[PDB]
Each structure stands twice: as C-alpha cells, then as structure tokens.
Design a protein around this ligand. Structure first.
Ligand SMILES: Cc1cc2nc3c(=O)[nH]c(=O)nc-3n(C[C@H](O)[C@H](O)[C@H](O)COP(=O)(O)OP(=O)(O)OC[C@H]3O[C@@H](n4cnc5c(N)ncnc54)[C@H](O)[C@@H]3O)c2cc1C
Ligand SMILES: [Cl-]
Length: 472
C-alpha cells in the first residue's frame, strides 16, 4: 500500500497517477481542503506559447533563483511542463487558451481556469480520486518510523501506528503560516517537514522564505493584490497618506516585490499602518475584475484606501529531493512545497509552484518501480543538530518571533534571539523555526528572499546550500 500525506495539488495528482499505474493508494490529510492549493488564484507556468520554450522558462527561473537553483531540476521541470499539462488535460481538465503574464517571466506562459485555478484543480483532482476509489482520510501525521534509513511505518493522530507501508509520499506543504503575517491557511505549519526531520530526513534552504509585498485581509479573507495594480496607478501610503516608498527606493510603487516588502516591513515596524489606493486607476473594473469582485463582496469601495500588509507566502526549502521526489530516506518521497527540489533556489518564480507540485505528482509513477537513487549533498554544507529540551511556545508567539527576528529584513542580533528562543524546544513548529533562523545566521550574505542588513551583498562563496541533519 502506498500512503500519501496531504491533499493538495501535489498529493492528489500523485494519488491519481499512482492509482492509474495500478498501485494501491491511500490519501491522508489533516484537512482535505487545507493547504495553499485550494486558495491559489493565479495560474500554472508552462512554456507552451509559440514565442516560448523550456530553455527560456528555465532562464527566467534561474534568474530569480539568484544562483541557488538546482540547474538539473529546473531543466527537468521546464522540459516536462508541456507533456505534464497535456497529460493532466487528457484526464479531463481544460485550461483556458489565453496564457497570462507574470512578473519575472519573459513571455506569457501562465495557464488559468476561472479566477480560482487552484480551487478548480483541487476539486477536479478530488473528483478523480473519488472515481478511482482512492480512500481519502482526514487524519494527521505525527510520526514516521524508519529502520536502516528506510521507511517502515508511520503514526497518525486518530489511528495510531500504520505498519503496512511500501512507500510514503509526503505532500504536506510549507510553513508560511509560522509567520505573524501569512497568506495561507493555518494548516501550513510545516509539521510534515519537521516529522520527516525527526526520522532522519535531510532538510535544506530553510532560510529562503518568500514574502508577498501587498496582501489584504478584509473580514478575514486573505487576498493577494497583484503588482499590476501599481503598474496601472495604484498608490501605497501609511496612515498619514505619504508615499514613504520613495524614501527607500526611487522606483516607488514600481520597485521589485522584495523592495516594497522591505520598505513596508520597516514602516510597519515603526507602528505605521499601510494602505494601497486604487482610486487613480483608469478603467479599474475592466482591468481588474477579480479584485473588483473581492472588494465588492466585502462592501469596500475600490475608491477608498485598502489596508494591506506583506506576508510569508512560499518557502523555497524543505525536504531535499532529486528530480523524482526521493529524499535521502529510502521509500520516503517529498513533493510539492514540503520538498526542496532546488527548482526555486533563492527565490521562487511565480506560477512555478503549482507546476512543481503537478510535475512531481503526475510523474511519480515513472520512478516508483525503480531502485532508489536518493540525494547528494555535494552542493552544500551539512549541519548536524541535536534537538533536546522541554521549552514550549504558543503558535502565536512563534509567529511573532519569526516575523520580527526571522523576517523580511534580518541581522545577527535578531537571528540570535530567534535561535536562542527555539533552542530548547522539541515542538515541530519550534524546530522548523529554529532551522530557518540557524541557516539565516550561517548565510552571511543577502541572496534572493534572504536579506541581511548586516550583510547586504551576495557572497560568491555562498553559492551552496545549507543542509540540516538530526543527530542524538
Ligand atoms: C494565496 C496563495 C496563492 C498562491 N497562488 C499560486 C499560484 O497562483 N501559482 C503557483 O504556482 N503557486 C501559487 N501559490 C503556491 C501554491 O498555491 C501551491 O499549492 C503550493 O506551493 C503547494 O502545494 P502542495 O500540494 O505541495 O501543498 P498544499 O496545497 O499546501 O498541501 C498541504 C496539504 O497537506 C496537509 N497537511 C499538512 N500537514 C499535515 C499533517 N501533519 N498530516 C496530514 N496532512 C497534512 C494539508 O491539510 C493540505 O491538504 C500560492 C500560495 C498562496 C498562499
Ligand atoms: Cl504565483
């Protein structure tokens, strides 16, 4: 029996694919509709345009990757995109013909289906899993059993010890919810990632957490405000109405995502409240139908300033894996956001994440019947860490500490505070937060979404990963 933990695009597509490959599969997820997949409102990258190509897509990916992208993985994912999309469509899913554009991409290559592509993909995959007879169980993974560096079983909250496992596919997503300001659901605390770590699984790139510059949460509904708004005339000001951005970068509202994130971050740290003003955008309703709808249902006049905030959005790292999704632990796969295939390097390229999940999931059957290859750490430095203690922190405290001391702008003093706070804890949320801070402190430079005011430049000597391994 093959077990898949997580019911997002990664876990679901793998489940359907494995089932079709004749495998007996069981899906287990703490919240069937949890994770980031259901609420993704953008699209899936694929160089299928007449003016595009896998190589160009690869070049764009490598660029934002800022030197940390695993070139082999990038080439594999971009070269697979077309046939994976085609396979997915043969299953009965149809993307729209119009390819959208996203910042960072040289050509239009983003596939969409309605204004809620993630939701559509989710429901579709869930419908197929049901028709394939795949059991979908709502339970929570809490432990993984390993012998001689191989998976033998695992434990769930509700059913306890599971001993009949030939393969365990972890598709539990990232830990962006471990930040006071997050764009995802509360399920994303990275416990799946921590549990794997406790079973001897190797983690990497924990310090490369990606933040989104302009997010809002009217009535509690999170909504990413596209950078295209600023391109059409959107303004950003504090509670006083001044366009502070100009004081950090001359490009103002037109500066890179990370730039605004840093400017906004500092401003808020002073206690200022930030807003975005869309009243000067011409033909707003025609240009931004989805934004208009979001604002309409919350009874917020798009002519009035909107409270915004930067937020933890996507984590580049996690369980290191090769192109197949194999971690260092035999029979333990990691796919989707919980894994670190090296596709994203120091900064994920928009739309490459749903693509990543779909590729590793749909392509998984191609490798399940082969001998295990595993991973190589020759592209980085392995750090062995021992977790021991009984200090316990609330989720709210952890999220505030990460936001302030392991956030958009970092430095040694703050990182050390975070390190010392989590040092004596064995809580999953604490461990993940600990490794992120530890790695951020070790990486004495600024690269991709990792920015240190005390080391503002990129160190060519750091063009390598920071791997973590648990020891007694
Ligand atoms: C608001 C938002 C919009 C986004 N939009 C896009 C986009 O437009 N295009 C793009 O490419 N990327 C986008 N991203 C990322 C993207 O949506 C992908 O879904 C994501 O990167 C990962 O998908 P996944 O299957 O790996 O995990 P998820 O979809 O996050 O999977 C998490 C699953 O694992 C389960 N789980 C977690 N822990 C446990 C546990 N311990 N036991 C059992 N189950 C567990 C969860 O309940 C959930 O079902 C967006 C992210 C956000 C937050
Ligand atoms: Cl995206």
């Amino acid at each position: 029996m093959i077990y898949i933990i997580g019911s997002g695009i990664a876990g679901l597509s793998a489940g359907v694919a494995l089932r079709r490959a004749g495998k007996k599969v069981t899906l287990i997820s703490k919240r069937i509709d949890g994770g980031s997949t259901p609420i993704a409102k953008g699209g899936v990258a694929a160089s299928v345009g007449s003016d595009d190509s896998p190589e160009l897509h690869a070049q764009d990916t490598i660029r934002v990757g800022d030197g940390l992208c695993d070139v082999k993985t990038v080439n594999y994912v971009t070269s697979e995109a077309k046939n994976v999309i085609e396979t997915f469509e043969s299953w009965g899913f149809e993307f729209e013909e119009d390819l959208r554009l996203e910042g960072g991409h040289t050509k239009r290559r983003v596939l969409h289906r309605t204004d809620e592509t993630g939701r559509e993909i989710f429901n579709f995959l869930l419908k197929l899993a049901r028709e394939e007879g795949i059991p979908i169980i709502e339970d929570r993974l809490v432990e993984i059993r390993v012998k001689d560096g191989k998976v033998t079983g695992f434990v769930t909250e509700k059913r306890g010890l599971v001993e009949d496992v030939d393969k365990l596919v972890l598709a539990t997503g990232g830990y962006s919810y471990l930040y006071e300001y997050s764009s995802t659901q509360s399920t994303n605390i990275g416990d799946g990632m921590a549990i794997a770590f406790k079973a001897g699984t190797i983690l990497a790139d924990m310090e490369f957490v990606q933040f989104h510059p302009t997010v809002t949460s009217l009535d509690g509904e999170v909504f990413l405000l596209t950078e295209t708004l600023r391109g059409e005339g959107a303004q950003i000001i504090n509670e006083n109405g001044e366009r502070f951005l100009f004081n950090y970068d001359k490009r103002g509202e037109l500066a890179p995502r990370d730039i605004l994130s840093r400017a906004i971050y500092i401003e808020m740290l002073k206690g200022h409240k930030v807003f975005i003003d869309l009243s000067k955008i011409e033909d707003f309703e025609r240009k931004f139908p989805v934004v208009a709808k979001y604002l309409a249902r919350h009874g917020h006049n798009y002519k009035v300033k909107i409270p915004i905030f930067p937020a933890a959005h996507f984590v580049d790292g996690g369980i290191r894996v090769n192109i197949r999704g194999e971690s260092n632990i035999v029979n333990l796969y990691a796919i989707g956001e919980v894994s670190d295939s090296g596709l994203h390097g120091a900064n994920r390229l928009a739309s490459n994440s749903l693509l990543e999940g779909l590729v590793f999931g749909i392509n998984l059957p191609r490798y399940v019947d082969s001998s295990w290859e595993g991973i190589s750490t020759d592209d980085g430095i392995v750090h062995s860490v021992r977790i021991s203690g009984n200090k316990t922190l609330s989720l709210k405290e952890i999220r505030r500490i990460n936001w302030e001391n392991v956030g958009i702008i970092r430095n040694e003093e703050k990182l050390v505070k975070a390190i010392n706070t989590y040092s004596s804890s064995t809580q999953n949320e604490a461990i993940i937060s600990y490794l992120t801070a530890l790695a951020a402190e070790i990486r004495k430079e600024s690269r991709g979404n990792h920015f240190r005011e005390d080391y503002p430049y990129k160190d060519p000597n750091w063009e390598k990963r920071i791997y973590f391994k648990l020891v007694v």
